[PDB]
Design a protein around this ligand. Structure first.
Ligand SMILES: Nc1ncnc2c1ncn2[C@@H]1O[C@H](COP(=O)(O)OP(=O)(O)O)[C@@H](O)[C@H]1O
Ligand SMILES: Nc1ncnc2c1ncn2[C@@H]1O[C@H](COP(=O)(O)OP(=O)(O)O)[C@@H](O)[C@H]1O
Ligand SMILES: Nc1ncnc2c1ncn2[C@@H]1O[C@H](COP(=O)(O)OP(=O)(O)O)[C@@H](O)[C@H]1O
Ligand SMILES: Nc1ncnc2c1ncn2[C@@H]1O[C@H](COP(=O)(O)OP(=O)(O)O)[C@@H](O)[C@H]1O
Lengths: 443, 68, 442, 436, 435
DNA sequence: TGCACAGGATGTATATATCTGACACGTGCCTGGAGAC
């Protein structure tokens, strides 16, 4: 019916109006202090005043670090942008890692714009061009004007088209009897389909039949758009959307990432500030999430030191599970969580704690509830004891083979024999390591 | 991208189930009346019928006395 | 095709209770691993859960890639099975995470349902109007059956399909509307007066009777990575074959995810997950493992199967040693299947199956000698000796491999151990680690 | 203009100095470091005089002791029109540009050229447009009535003005600006006629406006190189500009300077975290400072006797002695409790946070105990705890709650060290199970 | 006014007509033997006969090597090519380093071309083309403030004229030799045909219509190699927007260089050209890889190689790119066998004082004689460059207190404000947390 | 004796449905304004 994958039993942080976390609500069990700190961070993000704040989630493996970031993303809502990253994604072969980090920084700042469009639309009834005096004169096009007759509901208009508009008109392969849509902001033309006023069953090109557009031919409408700053940066960097030669050739070449200079970013910031001052724009800062932060090296950390001190950069959430580890790209420095101390000085560390037997048991119970399985109480106790003995994730991932083995025996509940058979068929890390130690030829 | 018609039909569950029932009702070859309460609830339903190219006529409060 | 190493395996050999038969479907022995692989296969065919990592481990020549091939054969068609090696991630054109993302998204299939209309009839009249340069093309087509007669309007693609495999006003053709395919079935009129240039030797068929137009429902499976490459740029269908899909941006991927969810909501499309098999997973950097640790937690993730044969070896990209060459973060969220070595009876059954596959007839004494030398040396050496002894068998003109043919094949070709013995005996003739050799024999 | 939420250096408006280059105790958002502020004022007068070039100034000190804030104060006190390029140390390791080429582009972005030119504009409010056209459009007759608040006129219109007016469609009551030579018509909006909104222009219709342009040398280098156009200034793929075009630009600038058609302005190139550069970058900087077209370079680092990158030996500040011989070093010091309290007060007033006096004393105590930046960061998250229980002023227990929730470095190191079995060490050994 | 940056008190070697260096001449203080050796090298370069000769000048830091190289460049004059270089500039990511080395080698060989510029400009009064669909010729009549002139023109220039949209009454610009056509604008006599117009209006040229001038073109062989080896193709005269495909550098083959040499050798024999070899100066030569050092041996044995000047301040140092090769000045011995080494000696107290006085005179600063000895003692105690770089903060601090003369209190204040390397190192050692 | 809490009563809110109600547009015609002397 539905697809579940290691998550989606979590719907939020699960707090009341005072910020006090319940013991079990919202799909979360335990970790009260971390959830309250994440609620404070959520309120700070919703305040929309700060810039360049950062927190770090530190804890052991399998303790709920990525779960808290996904709970923050669910508590914020879909309107606030959220860019999840892994630390290995910043190394690209097309552009340096500094530009990729700045791109992901600019990808987490949203914007909402009320946009006004001048629209000519209707049904094409007359398509008549007229010619130039000397078509082989070398300079100037072949034709001079194109007369287009458009008919909408309760209206009819005639237009004398520029040839440059007619290139986009004839690139869409319009004809007499087609409903078109001309956008005067960019010159883009959309061919909607054949009109339904004529016959239907005499076509061979699986076309779509559309009634006449309501209202007049010439229109003005207001459109609310959601746009990030990185979208404006890559739109101005590779210009596609005009009707000129360069904008036409921009759509045909193979795209490649380029080092966008800071001058373009200053110009985009100036235009966005003008749009905000005009009262048609609203700025929505977001969250950038970098999981497995220990994969970064010293150069990206040193650039991140500068990039957090700008006046645009969003809230950055990191995560790591290292105790005292040398930073990558260095030889002999040793720093907590693989994060250098100059970056550590600008953070706010949120500690995460391991679980107990009862918390493991109720987590197993809720994840068996989500996966639509029925578990007996003795099998649940055995699964909780296994989770304490080996791993929480190993007891989590043994539920579905137990369900398959129960279903092959024509049963609905999960009993102790299925758990024992899944133990015997499937191994964990410790038993595999113990087998590898007592092995013959590097098993 | 222009507003689609199939989406106009799938975002409303009542209209979707009405389409599913009307497919077998038209396959049976029948005659059917539908009652409404809003102006636009039948104005959009006329658009659904013209998408389905079904034969239909409309009677409401705005109709003149001769048309009835 | 030809005879490959795993060409004798058709399925996993399991009953309805997921209990492996000892000798069935080309797989012998290894009952625990076969039962576990059947459990994984039923988990894949369920299609409910996502992002499970399965690890197959053991000594070399044990049946790991054989198990993966058996799973892929039992999976059947229309479910994607992406099988890659560990060294294919490293490229000069894409990053490691981008190649891993493409390999992940190649294993998710989307089944799209389409409504089409089939037209089969006899061509009567063709009118084609083209401009002077031949660019703008339009025209009308008059086709008939034995009952009806309809005039259709033609576009550019229809005219291009007509002017290829040229129809000559009396051929019986079939047109699919949604696919744009034109198929010339044959000629029914058999006109006498014909130009002496083309062949026009088509077969004689009858004019079709009944309805000219018929509605039909068709389905097809398209991978997610195909949709990303197609919507990436203007000529993405060429990039599906040339492989020039350079670092597709994330906005394309999330818009494709939203559109796929919309199509599932509308009832148009359904999602079919698959299996991604990474053989020799130990040849991956720690950055690839760190990316896999987060890519396994997404909803659009397939069942990842990894196979390795290393013991406690050094993880690539670091300076410490780990079991199976994998860090403990990946080993925590993975489930391990352990394969075990064989007896002499399983070796004999394997050799008999491989001899039956290669159409090689063996005597009982030759099979016993091959079983003994596969017990002493590796199994793969005794598997490889069979065709060599077969060619020696027709070199003395008898179609039965005897003991002397196996003895001659053992004499001519060496093991791993015998070559090591000869090198350690004659070290002065080979170039060693320091580049020292003695070529002169005086 | 210049949209910004709140920065980490947003409270600094410049160096606090009098006319005799003496630092005030607290002025323009800067507290303490009087010798560093006086030295930076001397460097600012060095830049403002503009009679010498190619000087290196190194700012060194402990971390979180006013290093980047001094550069921000210098950049704010510099004013507009004077270039200021602020790059990081690790930004020059490109994939399509060499390190010396990236350093050359960073060097040549800090020298500007001042060109003054005068144009003619016609700005006013459109009263009436009368257009007469034929059937074929071969000829067009036009009359335009335009006005300001002081004059009224009517213009007989030519063909190209008519074609430039039907394009970018103007009506009555619009306020437009027309350039005669280029034919560019800009709609400034509508006038104050209800019947965006822009007040009607006053004075003469045809004004002579002089504008002063400031163009960097790198832009002229990109434009004069014929391989790429001016769009490479925005796309960024300039791609290893040759040297002969740079020599031509230098000779032409020196030729323009004698005839008075242009003026040279020098700027400041600021390289934060200069210890991340390679040895070859240092060797290029050693010769890039001995040129007439060179700015004043400010470098900042906090390393003390570290390993030079690309070598195998240790050097003071992570820099070789050839670069240290060409530089003058400004040293920053640590802060007392009163400087920390004043800086926290300024950061509280910047973020619009009301602090009680006891909360300020607690923040000062935990600032002199651990770090300045930790106590600066605690204020904005203590204010959310204050607003959660519906209170405006931040009290003592809110700061204590924020201290309890968010950890610092010294507590986290101890918590890691007591529980080292739960984390991954340098050997990749971890224990995940609780029991045994 | 004038910008001074670490140099420009050096105007030459200060030699006499016999090559004997005076003690204070040309802005040079001391250093007799190195200046005399550089004068001999300058005479050898002005001989213009030998190819591939290399010298190297070695010494301590801040001793006068780069000053000597710039003095050589000032002694040779501006018509002789001089390409400065640092050793780290050879590592480019577009081509191999050997290609960059050969490019910088061929950038130091120049040419001199005698040319003639002929220009017609003025208002168009007559534009009458004549055919025999193909125009045979076109007659254009120009007009200026000193009279008119009637010219015949081939249709090739007529195509460029109709490219520029030239009508009757426009002010144009025609180059006779190259056929370049530029439209300046409409004449001021037609400024009242409309009240509002798109055309721009310019007055008549006050000079004659026909102007002639003799110019001398200086090019290098690298410019011809670049111009003959454009990979995408040629370009127009005006291109404000760049090409759609980005052209990067390519490994230029030997065949193109041979053909360029053949064409230039043919043009020299007619007296059109003149060959001026130059100097390639590479500073910080110890930052070169062993592969570039090996390719330099091949490049120095060519027939067209210029004079190469190298500088280094290393002692017995390992060569970059190797592991256990110790050679003097960081230069491998097989290369060291091919040059002549010029030693450059350090300075004592009075020359340091005299150099400080010279830099104070150049920077337009007035220093008291009491402060000058303290500045010299400071320079001998720490560094010459530290004493030289402290003059401008001293001048600013003196000007702040309304004084135009340097008082020793300003020197003490500038010593207190700005530190040297040794005191900063002593702060680094006696500290706890990262300075 | 006063006050607070709970239950009932009533207003209302916003899209309907009928349903008029007074306005703006598509055809005749004839005579008077326009051309010519
Ligand atoms: N408090 C919790 N309640 C329920 N499930 C949890 C909790 N904490 C962790 N989990 C589960 O444990 C698994 C590992 O957590 P995650 O944060 O994804 O990895 P790690 O903790 O190693 O960073 C997740 O699948 C998550 O569902
Ligand atoms: N049960 C089996 N059925 C069929 N073939 C087998 C079996 N076990 C082993 N083999 C053969 O042995 C070899 C196994 O090696 P491989 O497939 O690389 O996996 P692994 O490396 O895990 O042993 C294959 O050539 C396969 O043909
Ligand atoms: N004299 C000062 N006046 C005002 N703020 C200061 C001062 N010194 C330090 N700060 C604050 O301390 C923080 C750290 O300063 P900074 O110099 O950027 O750190 P670092 O020394 O690591 O570069 C900055 O946010 C700045 O606002
Ligand atoms: N004989 C001299 N007379 C005057 N100034 C000199 C003399 N020798 C050196 N200098 C000055 O001393 C400085 C030494 O710089 P430079 O020669 O570049 O150092 P290096 O020799 O280490 O390259 C230069 O600024 C130069 O102006």
């Amino acid at each position: 019916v539905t697809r579940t994958a290691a998550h989606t039993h979590i719907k939020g942080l699960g707090l009341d109006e005072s910020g006090v976390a319940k013991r079990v609500e919202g799909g979360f069990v335990g970790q009260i202090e971390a959830r309250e700190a994440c609620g404070v961070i959520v309120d700070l993000i919703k305040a929309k005043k700060m810039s360049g704040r950062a927190i770090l989630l530190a804890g052991g493996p399998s303790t709920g670090k990525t779960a808290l970031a996904l709970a923050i993303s669910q508590e914020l809502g879909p309107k606030v942008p959220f860019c999840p990253l892994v630390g290995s994604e910043l190394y690209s072969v097309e552009v340096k890692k500094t530009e990729t980090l700045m791109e992901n920084f600019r990808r987490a700042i949203g914007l909402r714009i009320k946009e006004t469009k001048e629209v000519y639309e209707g049904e094409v009834t007359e398509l008549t061009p007229e010619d130039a005096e000397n078509p082989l004169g070398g300079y100037g096009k072949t034709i001079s004007h194109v007369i287009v007759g458009l008919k909408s509901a309760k209206g009819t208009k005639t237009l004398r088209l520029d040839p440059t508009i007619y290139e986009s008109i004839q690139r869409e392969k319009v004809s007499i009897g087609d409903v078109i849509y001309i956008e005067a902001n960019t010159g883009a033309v959309k061919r909607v389909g054949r009109s339904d006023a004529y016959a239907t069953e005499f076509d061979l090109e699986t076309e779509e039949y559309v009634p006449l557009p309501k209202g007049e031919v010439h229109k003005k409408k207001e459109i609310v758009q959601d746009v990030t700053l990185h979208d404006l940066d890559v739109a101005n960097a590779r210009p596609q959307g005009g009707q000129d030669v360069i904008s036409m050739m921009g759509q045909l070449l193979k795209p490649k990432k380029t080092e966008i200079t800071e001058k373009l970013r200053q110009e985009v910031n100036k235009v966005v500030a003008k749009y905000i001052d005009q009262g048609v724009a609203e700025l929505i800062p977001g969250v950038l999430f970098i999981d497995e932060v220990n994969m970064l090296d010293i150069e990206i950390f040193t650039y991140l030191n500068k990039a957090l001190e700008s006046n645009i950069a969003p809230v950055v959430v990191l995560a790591s599970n290292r105790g005292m580890t040398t930073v990558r790209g260095t030889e002999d420095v040793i720093s907590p969580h693989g994060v250098p101390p100059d970056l550590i000085d600008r953070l706010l560390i949120v500690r995460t704690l391991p679980y107990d037997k009862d918390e493991i048991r109720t987590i197993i119970e809720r994840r068996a509830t989500v996966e639509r399985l029925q578990v007996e109480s003795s099998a649940l106790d055995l699964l909780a004891t296994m989770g304490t003995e080996t791993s929480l994730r190993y007891a989590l991932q043994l539920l579905a083979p137990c369900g398959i083995l129960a279903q092959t025996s024509n049963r609905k509940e999960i009993v102790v024999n299925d758990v024992n058979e899944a133990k015997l068929l499937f191994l964990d890390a410790k038993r595999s390591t113990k087998i590898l130690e007592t092995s013959a030829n590097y098993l | 991208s222009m507003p689609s018609m199939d989406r106009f039909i799938t975002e409303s569950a009542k209209l979707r189930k009405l389409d599913e029932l009307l497919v077998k009702l038209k396959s049976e070859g029948h005659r059917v009346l539908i009652y409404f309460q809003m102006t636009k609830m039948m104005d959009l339903m006329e658009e659904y019928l013209t998408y389905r190219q079904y034969n239909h006529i409309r009677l409401d409060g705005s109709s003149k006395l001769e048309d009835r | 095709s030809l005879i490959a190493a795993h060409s004798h395996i058709t399925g996993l050999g399991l009953d309805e209770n997921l209990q492996p038969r000892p000798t069935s479907e080309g797989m012998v022995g290894q009952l625990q691993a076969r039962r576990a692989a059947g459990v994984i296969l039923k988990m894949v065919q369920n299609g409910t859960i996502a992002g499970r990592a399965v690890l197959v481990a053991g000594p070399p020549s044990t049946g790991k890639t054989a198990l993966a091939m058996g799973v892929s054969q039992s999976l059947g068609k229309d479910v994607p099975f992406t099988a890659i090696a560990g060294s294919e991630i490293f490229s000069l054109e894409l990053s490691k995470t981008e190649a891993l993302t493409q390999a992940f998204r190649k294993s998710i299939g989307i089944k799209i349902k389409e409504e089409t209309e089939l037209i089969e009839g006899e061509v009567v009249e063709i009118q084609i109007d083209r401009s002077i340069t031949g660019g703008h093309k339009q025209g009308k087509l008059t086709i008939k059956t034995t009952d009806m007669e309809t005039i259709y309007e033609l576009g550019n693609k229809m005219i291009d399909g007509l002017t290829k495999e040229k129809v000559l006003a009396g051929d019986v053709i079939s047109i699919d509307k949604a696919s744009g395919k034109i198929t010339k079935l044959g000629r029914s009129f058999a006109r006498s007066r014909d130009y002496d240039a083309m062949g026009a030797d088509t077969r004689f068929v009858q004019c079709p009777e009944g309805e000219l137009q018929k509605r039909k429902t068709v389905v097809h499976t398209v991978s997610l990575h195909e949709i990303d490459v197609i919507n990436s740029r203007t000529q993405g269908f060429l990039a599906l074959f040339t492989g020039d899909t350079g670092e597709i941006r994330s906005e394309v991927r999330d818009q494709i995810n939203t559109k796929v969810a919309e199509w599932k909501e509308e009832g148009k499309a359904e999602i079919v997950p698959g299996v991604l098999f990474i053989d020799e997973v130990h040849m991956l950097d720690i950055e690839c493992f760190s990316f896999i640790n987060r890519a396994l937690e997404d909803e659009f993730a397939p069942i990842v199967m990894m196979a390795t044969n290393r013991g406690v070896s050094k993880t690539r990209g670091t300076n410490y040693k780990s079991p199976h060459g994998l860090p403990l973060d990946l080993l925590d969220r993975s489930i391990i299947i352990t394969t075990k070595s064989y007896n002499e009876q399983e070796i004999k059954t394997i050799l008999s199956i491989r001899a039956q596959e290669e159409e090689v007839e063996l005597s009982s004494d030759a099979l016993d000698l091959l079983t003994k030398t596969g017990v002493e040396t590796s199994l793969r050496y005794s598997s490889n000796l069979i065709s060599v002894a077969q060619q020696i068998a027709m070199k003395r003109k008898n179609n039965t491999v005897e003991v002397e043919d196996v003895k001659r094949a053992y004499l001519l070709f060496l093991d791993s151990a015998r070559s090591v013995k000869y090198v350690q005996e004659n070290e002065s003739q080979y170039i060693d680690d320091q580049g020292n050799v003695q070529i002169s024999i005086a």
